[PDB]
Design a protein around this ligand. Sequence first.
Ligand SMILES: [Zn+2]
Ligand SMILES: [Zn+2]
Ligand SMILES: [Zn+2]
Length: 70
Amino acid sequence: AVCGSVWGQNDLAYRCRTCEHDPTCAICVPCFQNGNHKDHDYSIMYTGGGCCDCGDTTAWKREGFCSRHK
Ligand SMILES: [Zn+2]
Ligand SMILES: [Zn+2]
Ligand SMILES: [Zn+2]
């Protein structure tokens, strides 16, 4: 249902200010690639590590879910 991917402090991930419900949200690189964020305010960057929010309605807009957690 919700991507269980975890990453470390020197692993890249994606912020998307269009899709997020708060500034600490983030999704993993594969979930970003397999989703639809054209014209979104997104950035690949480091996040101090984290757990993917893709598929979690409390953290991320449904339109921003990748094809595998939608
Ligand atoms: Zn987005
Ligand atoms: Zn993910
Ligand atoms: Zn996903």
